[PDB]
Structures are given as structure tokens and as C-alpha cells.
mmCIF file of C-alpha atoms in Angstrom:
data_model
loop_
_atom_site.group_PDB
_atom_site.id
_atom_site.type_symbol
_atom_site.label_atom_id
_atom_site.label_comp_id
_atom_site.label_asym_id
_atom_site.label_seq_id
_atom_site.Cartn_x
_atom_site.Cartn_y
_atom_site.Cartn_z
ATOM 1 C CA UNK Y 1 106.493 131.201 99.599
ATOM 2 C CA UNK Y 2 103.197 131.374 101.607
ATOM 3 C CA UNK Y 3 101.975 131.370 105.124
ATOM 4 C CA UNK Y 4 99.447 128.916 106.952
ATOM 5 C CA UNK Y 5 96.469 129.941 108.862
ATOM 6 C CA UNK Y 6 93.818 127.926 110.737
ATOM 7 C CA UNK Y 7 90.277 128.803 111.192
ATOM 8 C CA UNK Y 8 87.244 126.619 112.985
ATOM 9 C CA UNK Y 9 83.821 126.638 111.736
ATOM 10 C CA UNK Y 10 81.096 124.544 113.800
ATOM 11 C CA UNK Y 11 79.582 121.946 111.185
ATOM 12 C CA UNK Y 12 75.587 122.470 111.730
ATOM 13 C CA UNK Y 13 74.986 125.817 110.187
ATOM 14 C CA UNK Y 14 74.592 127.688 106.834
ATOM 15 C CA UNK Y 15 77.344 128.998 104.131
ATOM 16 C CA UNK Y 16 77.045 132.547 106.268
ATOM 17 C CA UNK Y 17 79.108 130.983 108.934
ATOM 18 C CA UNK Y 18 81.882 129.938 106.632
ATOM 19 C CA UNK Y 19 82.127 133.015 104.699
ATOM 20 C CA UNK Y 20 81.872 135.052 108.098
ATOM 21 C CA UNK Y 21 85.041 132.590 109.239
ATOM 22 C CA UNK Y 22 86.922 133.331 105.787
ATOM 23 C CA UNK Y 23 86.281 137.307 106.510
ATOM 24 C CA UNK Y 24 87.474 136.890 109.743
ATOM 25 C CA UNK Y 25 90.978 135.202 108.419
ATOM 26 C CA UNK Y 26 91.315 137.551 105.856
ATOM 27 C CA UNK Y 27 90.839 140.707 108.229
ATOM 28 C CA UNK Y 28 93.734 139.280 110.419
ATOM 29 C CA UNK Y 29 95.653 138.738 107.622
ATOM 30 C CA UNK Y 30 94.895 142.406 106.604
ATOM 31 C CA UNK Y 31 93.711 144.622 109.433
ATOM 32 C CA UNK Y 32 96.507 143.170 111.906
ATOM 33 C CA UNK Y 33 99.244 141.144 110.326
ATOM 34 C CA UNK Y 34 100.199 139.169 112.885
ATOM 35 C CA UNK Y 35 103.432 137.114 113.350
ATOM 36 C CA UNK Y 36 103.266 133.276 111.768
ATOM 37 C CA UNK Y 37 103.956 130.606 114.355
ATOM 38 C CA UNK Y 38 107.706 129.307 114.538
ATOM 39 C CA UNK Y 39 106.272 125.459 114.772
ATOM 40 C CA UNK Y 40 105.234 125.812 110.913
ATOM 41 C CA UNK Y 41 107.802 128.333 109.705
ATOM 42 C CA UNK Y 42 109.810 125.993 108.052
ATOM 43 C CA UNK Y 43 106.636 124.432 106.380
ATOM 44 C CA UNK Y 44 106.018 128.439 105.066
ATOM 45 C CA UNK Y 45 109.182 128.184 102.980
ATOM 46 C CA UNK Y 46 108.175 125.178 101.054
ATOM 47 C CA UNK Y 47 105.640 124.551 98.123
ATOM 48 C CA UNK Y 48 102.747 122.323 98.907
ATOM 49 C CA UNK Y 49 101.158 119.783 96.654
ATOM 50 C CA UNK Y 50 98.089 118.587 99.090
ATOM 51 C CA UNK Y 51 97.178 118.857 102.558
ATOM 52 C CA UNK Y 52 94.957 116.268 104.708
ATOM 53 C CA UNK Y 53 93.288 116.819 108.376
ATOM 54 C CA UNK Y 54 92.650 113.684 110.560
ATOM 55 C CA UNK Y 55 90.385 113.429 113.540
ATOM 56 C CA UNK Y 56 93.174 114.853 115.762
ATOM 57 C CA UNK Y 57 96.340 115.723 113.521
ATOM 58 C CA UNK Y 58 97.259 117.050 110.265
ATOM 59 C CA UNK Y 59 99.513 115.939 107.325
ATOM 60 C CA UNK Y 60 101.126 118.455 104.688
ATOM 61 C CA UNK Y 61 102.327 117.015 101.761
ATOM 62 C CA UNK Y 62 105.818 118.462 99.874
ATOM 63 C CA UNK Y 63 106.630 118.821 96.082
ATOM 64 C CA UNK Y 64 110.274 117.291 96.702
ATOM 65 C CA UNK Y 65 108.139 113.765 98.138
ATOM 66 C CA UNK Y 66 108.378 114.987 101.716
ATOM 67 C CA UNK Y 67 105.238 114.116 104.335
ATOM 68 C CA UNK Y 68 105.099 115.993 107.653
ATOM 69 C CA UNK Y 69 102.407 115.418 110.589
ATOM 70 C CA UNK Y 70 101.247 118.015 113.258
ATOM 71 C CA UNK Y 71 99.271 117.899 116.206
ATOM 72 C CA UNK Y 72 96.362 120.182 116.604
ATOM 73 C CA UNK Y 73 92.879 120.661 119.221
ATOM 74 C CA UNK Y 74 90.204 123.225 119.229
ATOM 75 C CA UNK Y 75 89.507 124.496 122.713
ATOM 76 C CA UNK Y 76 85.784 125.558 123.259
ATOM 77 C CA UNK Y 77 86.530 128.695 125.828
ATOM 78 C CA UNK Y 78 88.322 130.228 122.780
ATOM 79 C CA UNK Y 79 85.884 129.194 120.326
ATOM 80 C CA UNK Y 80 94.285 131.224 115.922
ATOM 81 C CA UNK Y 81 91.664 129.190 117.824
ATOM 82 C CA UNK Y 82 93.589 125.982 117.171
ATOM 83 C CA UNK Y 83 96.362 125.248 119.558
ATOM 84 C CA UNK Y 84 99.300 123.138 117.669
ATOM 85 C CA UNK Y 85 101.920 120.758 118.832
ATOM 86 C CA UNK Y 86 104.806 122.104 120.223
ATOM 87 C CA UNK Y 87 106.869 119.965 117.490
ATOM 88 C CA UNK Y 88 106.053 118.484 114.321
ATOM 89 C CA UNK Y 89 107.069 115.061 113.363
ATOM 90 C CA UNK Y 90 108.436 114.202 109.742
ATOM 91 C CA UNK Y 91 108.110 111.180 107.780
ATOM 92 C CA UNK Y 92 111.324 108.614 108.194
ATOM 93 C CA UNK Y 93 112.649 108.897 104.692
ATOM 94 C CA UNK Y 94 114.526 105.671 103.897
ATOM 95 C CA UNK Y 95 116.259 105.223 100.125
ATOM 96 C CA UNK Y 96 114.430 108.293 99.015
ATOM 97 C CA UNK Y 97 110.652 107.309 99.155
ATOM 98 C CA UNK Y 98 109.855 110.623 97.121
ATOM 99 C CA UNK Y 99 106.018 109.790 97.581
ATOM 100 C CA UNK Y 100 103.240 111.671 95.532
ATOM 101 C CA UNK Y 101 99.991 111.508 96.824
ATOM 102 C CA UNK Y 102 98.578 111.578 100.364
ATOM 103 C CA UNK Y 103 94.979 110.885 102.083
ATOM 104 C CA UNK Y 104 93.847 110.836 105.654
ATOM 105 C CA UNK Y 105 91.989 107.859 107.971
ATOM 106 C CA UNK Y 106 90.427 107.933 111.243
ATOM 107 C CA UNK Y 107 93.095 105.476 112.285
ATOM 108 C CA UNK Y 108 95.903 106.328 110.127
ATOM 109 C CA UNK Y 109 97.110 108.127 107.171
ATOM 110 C CA UNK Y 110 97.708 107.074 103.344
ATOM 111 C CA UNK Y 111 100.816 107.655 101.266
ATOM 112 C CA UNK Y 112 101.825 106.955 97.504
ATOM 113 C CA UNK Y 113 105.312 106.398 96.523
ATOM 114 C CA UNK Y 114 106.726 107.530 93.358
ATOM 115 C CA UNK Y 115 107.058 103.371 92.194
ATOM 116 C CA UNK Y 116 103.766 102.953 94.130
ATOM 117 C CA UNK Y 117 103.378 101.666 97.794
ATOM 118 C CA UNK Y 118 100.698 102.430 100.150
ATOM 119 C CA UNK Y 119 102.856 103.734 102.896
ATOM 120 C CA UNK Y 120 100.699 104.002 105.964
ATOM 121 C CA UNK Y 121 101.178 104.421 110.011
ATOM 122 C CA UNK Y 122 98.384 105.043 112.447
ATOM 123 C CA UNK Y 123 97.927 108.381 114.608
ATOM 124 C CA UNK Y 124 98.308 106.656 117.489
ATOM 125 C CA UNK Y 125 101.640 105.332 117.267
ATOM 126 C CA UNK Y 126 104.696 107.045 115.998
ATOM 127 C CA UNK Y 127 106.425 104.885 112.761
ATOM 128 C CA UNK Y 128 105.754 103.984 109.307
ATOM 129 C CA UNK Y 129 104.452 100.425 108.962
ATOM 130 C CA UNK Y 130 107.432 97.638 109.224
ATOM 131 C CA UNK Y 131 106.341 94.364 108.803
ATOM 132 C CA UNK Y 132 109.513 92.226 110.203
ATOM 133 C CA UNK Y 133 108.328 88.899 107.895
ATOM 134 C CA UNK Y 134 108.310 91.236 104.486
ATOM 135 C CA UNK Y 135 110.615 94.563 104.769
ATOM 136 C CA UNK Y 136 109.352 95.081 101.185
ATOM 137 C CA UNK Y 137 105.442 95.465 102.523
ATOM 138 C CA UNK Y 138 103.484 97.969 104.250
ATOM 139 C CA UNK Y 139 100.026 98.601 104.776
ATOM 140 C CA UNK Y 140 99.317 94.878 105.956
ATOM 141 C CA UNK Y 141 96.227 94.983 104.225
ATOM 142 C CA UNK Y 142 98.017 95.662 100.906
ATOM 143 C CA UNK Y 143 98.101 92.223 100.089
ATOM 144 C CA UNK Y 144 94.596 91.665 101.052
ATOM 145 C CA UNK Y 145 93.597 94.447 98.379
ATOM 146 C CA UNK Y 146 96.074 93.017 95.727
ATOM 147 C CA UNK Y 147 98.035 96.531 95.097
ATOM 148 C CA UNK Y 148 101.561 95.124 96.148
ATOM 149 C CA UNK Y 149 102.464 94.626 92.194
ATOM 150 C CA UNK Y 150 100.683 97.419 90.539
ATOM 151 C CA UNK Y 151 101.607 101.359 89.908
ATOM 152 C CA UNK Y 152 99.371 103.671 91.896
ATOM 153 C CA UNK Y 153 98.067 106.668 90.376
ATOM 154 C CA UNK Y 154 95.421 108.092 92.188
ATOM 155 C CA UNK Y 155 94.120 108.037 95.667
ATOM 156 C CA UNK Y 156 91.457 109.268 97.638
ATOM 157 C CA UNK Y 157 90.416 108.793 101.337
ATOM 158 C CA UNK Y 158 87.585 110.127 104.034
ATOM 159 C CA UNK Y 159 87.026 109.159 107.560
ATOM 160 C CA UNK Y 160 86.356 105.609 107.457
ATOM 161 C CA UNK Y 161 86.817 104.808 103.686
ATOM 162 C CA UNK Y 162 89.634 104.745 100.614
ATOM 163 C CA UNK Y 163 90.132 104.252 97.463
ATOM 164 C CA UNK Y 164 92.985 103.658 94.861
ATOM 165 C CA UNK Y 165 93.165 103.258 91.044
ATOM 166 C CA UNK Y 166 96.270 102.415 89.461
ATOM 167 C CA UNK Y 167 97.916 102.666 86.051
ATOM 168 C CA UNK Y 168 95.781 99.757 84.799
ATOM 169 C CA UNK Y 169 92.570 101.073 85.638
ATOM 170 C CA UNK Y 170 91.653 99.200 88.821
ATOM 171 C CA UNK Y 171 89.807 100.399 91.206
ATOM 172 C CA UNK Y 172 90.563 98.833 94.593
ATOM 173 C CA UNK Y 173 88.435 100.431 97.851
ATOM 174 C CA UNK Y 174 88.392 99.287 101.629
ATOM 175 C CA UNK Y 175 87.388 100.623 104.558
ATOM 176 C CA UNK Y 176 89.411 101.499 108.013
ATOM 177 C CA UNK Y 177 90.618 99.365 110.581
ATOM 178 C CA UNK Y 178 88.267 100.475 113.102
ATOM 179 C CA UNK Y 179 85.432 99.197 110.850
ATOM 180 C CA UNK Y 180 86.097 95.565 110.138
ATOM 181 C CA UNK Y 181 83.003 93.634 110.626
ATOM 182 C CA UNK Y 182 81.508 94.902 107.924
ATOM 183 C CA UNK Y 183 84.626 95.100 105.514
ATOM 184 C CA UNK Y 184 83.142 91.568 103.702
ATOM 185 C CA UNK Y 185 80.438 94.138 101.755
ATOM 186 C CA UNK Y 186 82.194 97.461 101.438
ATOM 187 C CA UNK Y 187 85.408 96.031 99.936
ATOM 188 C CA UNK Y 188 86.541 95.147 96.761
ATOM 189 C CA UNK Y 189 90.236 94.057 95.685
ATOM 190 C CA UNK Y 190 92.113 95.238 92.658
ATOM 191 C CA UNK Y 191 89.891 94.824 89.590
ATOM 192 C CA UNK Y 192 89.275 96.185 86.583
ATOM 193 C CA UNK Y 193 85.626 97.317 85.460
ATOM 194 C CA UNK Y 194 83.469 97.165 82.146
ATOM 195 C CA UNK Y 195 81.786 100.615 83.541
ATOM 196 C CA UNK Y 196 85.102 102.310 83.186
ATOM 197 C CA UNK Y 197 85.671 102.246 79.199
ATOM 198 C CA UNK Y 198 89.552 102.241 79.691
ATOM 199 C CA UNK Y 199 90.585 106.051 79.639
ATOM 200 C CA UNK Y 200 93.024 107.430 82.288
ATOM 201 C CA UNK Y 201 91.245 108.003 85.202
ATOM 202 C CA UNK Y 202 91.233 111.843 85.719
ATOM 203 C CA UNK Y 203 90.517 112.032 89.230
ATOM 204 C CA UNK Y 204 88.893 109.960 91.983
ATOM 205 C CA UNK Y 205 87.146 111.479 94.962
ATOM 206 C CA UNK Y 206 84.976 109.524 97.648
ATOM 207 C CA UNK Y 207 83.003 110.594 101.091
ATOM 208 C CA UNK Y 208 81.811 108.474 104.142
ATOM 209 C CA UNK Y 209 79.823 106.335 101.864
ATOM 210 C CA UNK Y 210 80.416 106.052 98.465
ATOM 211 C CA UNK Y 211 82.834 107.355 95.523
ATOM 212 C CA UNK Y 212 83.026 109.151 92.240
ATOM 213 C CA UNK Y 213 85.558 108.947 89.685
ATOM 214 C CA UNK Y 214 86.070 111.475 86.840
ATOM 215 C CA UNK Y 215 87.130 110.364 83.742
ATOM 216 C CA UNK Y 216 87.869 112.477 80.606
ATOM 217 C CA UNK Y 217 83.997 113.066 79.934
ATOM 218 C CA UNK Y 218 82.271 111.310 82.316
ATOM 219 C CA UNK Y 219 81.791 111.006 86.141
ATOM 220 C CA UNK Y 220 80.854 107.353 87.484
ATOM 221 C CA UNK Y 221 79.889 106.834 91.217
ATOM 222 C CA UNK Y 222 79.351 103.297 93.122
ATOM 223 C CA UNK Y 223 78.947 102.902 96.901
ATOM 224 C CA UNK Y 224 76.219 102.663 99.142
ATOM 225 C CA UNK Y 225 73.057 104.074 97.447
ATOM 226 C CA UNK Y 226 71.551 107.200 98.864
ATOM 227 C CA UNK Y 227 69.248 107.204 101.814
ATOM 228 C CA UNK Y 228 66.307 108.672 99.993
ATOM 229 C CA UNK Y 229 66.654 106.210 97.470
ATOM 230 C CA UNK Y 230 66.915 103.716 100.357
ATOM 231 C CA UNK Y 231 63.589 104.818 101.869
ATOM 232 C CA UNK Y 232 61.958 104.761 98.757
ATOM 233 C CA UNK Y 233 62.968 101.236 98.090
ATOM 234 C CA UNK Y 234 62.019 99.963 101.457
ATOM 235 C CA UNK Y 235 58.817 101.500 100.960
ATOM 236 C CA UNK Y 236 58.046 100.321 97.468
ATOM 237 C CA UNK Y 237 58.638 96.766 98.966
ATOM 238 C CA UNK Y 238 57.405 95.972 102.283
ATOM 239 C CA UNK Y 239 54.230 98.240 101.176
ATOM 240 C CA UNK Y 240 53.584 96.878 98.017
ATOM 241 C CA UNK Y 241 52.549 93.745 99.388
ATOM 242 C CA UNK Y 242 48.916 94.722 100.178
ATOM 243 C CA UNK Y 243 59.014 93.884 110.482
ATOM 244 C CA UNK Y 244 61.400 96.129 107.947
ATOM 245 C CA UNK Y 245 64.264 95.090 109.861
ATOM 246 C CA UNK Y 246 64.976 92.223 112.612
ATOM 247 C CA UNK Y 247 66.425 93.016 115.828
ATOM 248 C CA UNK Y 248 69.815 92.421 116.563
ATOM 249 C CA UNK Y 249 71.012 93.887 113.609
ATOM 250 C CA UNK Y 250 74.971 95.378 113.282
ATOM 251 C CA UNK Y 251 75.574 98.306 111.587
ATOM 252 C CA UNK Y 252 78.131 101.362 111.349
ATOM 253 C CA UNK Y 253 77.445 105.168 111.928
ATOM 254 C CA UNK Y 254 79.599 108.415 111.511
ATOM 255 C CA UNK Y 255 77.527 109.830 114.075
ATOM 256 C CA UNK Y 256 78.948 112.867 116.147
ATOM 257 C CA UNK Y 257 82.143 112.716 114.085
ATOM 258 C CA UNK Y 258 83.263 109.306 115.304
ATOM 259 C CA UNK Y 259 82.310 106.131 113.297
ATOM 260 C CA UNK Y 260 80.777 103.778 115.793
ATOM 261 C CA UNK Y 261 79.461 100.237 115.154
ATOM 262 C CA UNK Y 262 76.478 98.882 117.028
ATOM 263 C CA UNK Y 263 73.540 96.649 117.168
ATOM 264 C CA UNK Y 264 69.986 97.342 117.113
ATOM 265 C CA UNK Y 265 67.712 96.508 119.768
ATOM 266 C CA UNK Y 266 64.596 95.981 118.527
ATOM 267 C CA UNK Y 267 62.728 96.229 114.852
ATOM 268 C CA UNK Y 268 61.940 99.168 112.979
ATOM 269 C CA UNK Y 269 58.549 99.715 111.844
ATOM 270 C CA UNK Y 270 58.498 103.279 110.444
ATOM 271 C CA UNK Y 271 61.491 104.180 108.496
ATOM 272 C CA UNK Y 272 61.346 107.988 109.707
ATOM 273 C CA UNK Y 273 61.496 107.011 113.364
ATOM 274 C CA UNK Y 274 64.687 107.079 115.418
ATOM 275 C CA UNK Y 275 65.565 104.013 116.876
ATOM 276 C CA UNK Y 276 67.873 103.193 120.051
ATOM 277 C CA UNK Y 277 71.085 101.163 119.654
ATOM 278 C CA UNK Y 278 73.381 98.929 122.034
ATOM 279 C CA UNK Y 279 77.160 100.236 121.095
ATOM 280 C CA UNK Y 280 79.519 97.514 120.243
ATOM 281 C CA UNK Y 281 82.937 98.517 121.628
ATOM 282 C CA UNK Y 282 86.137 98.015 119.312
ATOM 283 C CA UNK Y 283 87.690 96.053 122.349
ATOM 284 C CA UNK Y 284 84.721 93.696 122.748
ATOM 285 C CA UNK Y 285 85.403 92.120 119.123
ATOM 286 C CA UNK Y 286 88.831 90.737 120.207
ATOM 287 C CA UNK Y 287 76.724 101.798 126.185
ATOM 288 C CA UNK Y 288 73.063 102.950 125.132
ATOM 289 C CA UNK Y 289 72.975 105.346 122.110
ATOM 290 C CA UNK Y 290 70.041 106.565 120.201
ATOM 291 C CA UNK Y 291 71.369 106.675 116.788
ATOM 292 C CA UNK Y 292 69.528 108.679 113.856
ATOM 293 C CA UNK Y 293 67.850 106.322 111.677
ATOM 294 C CA UNK Y 294 69.263 108.069 108.636
ATOM 295 C CA UNK Y 295 73.054 107.584 109.230
ATOM 296 C CA UNK Y 296 72.689 104.350 110.259
ATOM 297 C CA UNK Y 297 73.559 101.844 106.938
ATOM 298 C CA UNK Y 298 71.764 98.450 108.052
ATOM 299 C CA UNK Y 299 74.964 96.544 106.695
ATOM 300 C CA UNK Y 300 73.352 93.188 107.366
ATOM 301 C CA UNK Y 301 71.631 92.876 103.750
ATOM 302 C CA UNK Y 302 68.585 91.820 105.054
ATOM 303 C CA UNK Y 303 58.034 86.814 97.098
ATOM 304 C CA UNK Y 304 60.630 88.976 95.336
ATOM 305 C CA UNK Y 305 63.795 89.650 97.022
ATOM 306 C CA UNK Y 306 64.544 92.165 99.385
ATOM 307 C CA UNK Y 307 66.012 95.500 97.798
ATOM 308 C CA UNK Y 308 69.594 96.015 97.498
ATOM 309 C CA UNK Y 309 71.112 98.944 99.527
ATOM 310 C CA UNK Y 310 74.442 98.529 97.453
#
């Protein structure tokens, strides 16, 4: 038995604001003791293993192998401040899937079954993926990842990135559907690494850039190198020879809470300088924004060799 509460904390701020919001939710729980929301009343009685929050919805996991989704939106005039959806949509259960782990992505969700299958479906639509040609295959990227014949034991997710570790100690990483033009660099299929000594992968966590795995007595991180290290390498490559980036190079950013892919108009000379970018709309693959220099990735991978940002 439990009760569900919501709170909103504006991102640029200090820990004091977070503590103040937690204080407010505690006071609401104690001083006033407001009634529970009927839409989540059923979910209150059920135990919870994990919960994830998407860009616009939230997904709850059950100990009985059940996953549910609900809609939320935060209004600025009232800034519970979160207005929830009128109705909650469950997971269509066939043959008792009995999921284990869940994760949230910008364009979809991710689930792991008891046998292990990356069940997923987008936030826009309302049905789990159903391949007509292969009714036993879900997550059309599953074959490309190479996880269609393995037992998934750990899953981790962020807005754009996802990673899965199987029982065979193989870590497979990829990005979201929106970020596809850069997938040639950030994606590794199912593969065992000699860095992992073969012990049971205790935990896997990831962020918008890289991913860290916790073993029994070690932490191993991989992905994009930190921006401070990127700047250090850039200043230790061009300057030591005594046009950092050519124009028209594509990249992606997670600025303002939305991952967007765009090109750069002019070459960058000073790394700390903020450069304008030309937005590349997702529909254009099938307007002008001055992106922050630090959040840009420069995925184009553009005398000794150029330092690698990966």
C-alpha cells in the first residue's frame, strides 16, 4: 500500500529549491492530508518495482509483470501542479508477458519480458509494436542490435540513449528514433568486451552522453568523453602546432529539453564562443537557433591524427 504524489522543480536552480519542494509535498502529506486522485487509486494499492517519466507521459511497473502509462502536463499559471490524464492506458497483455524492467525514451518506452524481449511502443501511438511479417519480433531495431536471441537482464535508458546488458555479459547501446543520422557512431551491437572481466553486471546506468556499468567491485564508463576533456584535447591539438571545425557539420543537442539535430553555418575559432546553428527538421530527412557550444556534440568526427571525442 502506498500513495502517489507529484512535484515540479524548475531545472536551473540549487538543491535548496529541491529541498523546498520536498518540504512542500511533506507538508501537504501532513498538515492538510488531501484525498488521493481517483485516476491513480488502483495504482496505489499495487506494489511498484520501477517508475519512469517520459517527455509527456509516465510509465509505472508492477511486481506482477504489468506496465501502465498515464498522461501528465505542467501548467505555468499554477506553478498537485501537474494535471494528469483523464484515463490511464494499460499494456495489452497476451500470453502473460510478465515484464521485469522498464525504461523511458523521448519517442517511445522500453520493456523487458520474463524471457527477455525489448517490447516497446511510441508515446504518440497507442499499441505495442506488432511486425506483420514476424509476429514474434518487436522493437524493429532488435535485429539490428542483435538482441533477438539473448536473455536481457539489465536495461538502462535516458531521453535519447538506451543500453541493455544480457545474461551473456554483452552490452548493446543505441540512440532514439529521432537521432538516426548520427547512429553510425553512438551504436554498438550485441558484443562482449574484454574490459568487463565476466562478473555478473550488478547495475547499468546512463545519461544523455555516456553510460556507466557497476560490477561487483568496479565501475566502468564508456561513451562521449566529457566536454572539459574535449576542450582540453582541442586546445592541445591545434595550438601545439606552433579552423577548429569546418562549416556545414551536423550534430545533435539536448538543449531546452528537446533533442534536436542541426548543422553549423560558420567555422568555430574559439571553443568557448557560442556559435549559431541551422535547424534540421526531422521531416526534412524523409529555423535558426544559436545553440550553446558546450551542449553540441560535433559527431562528424572531423601531422598527428585529430583527437577523438569518443
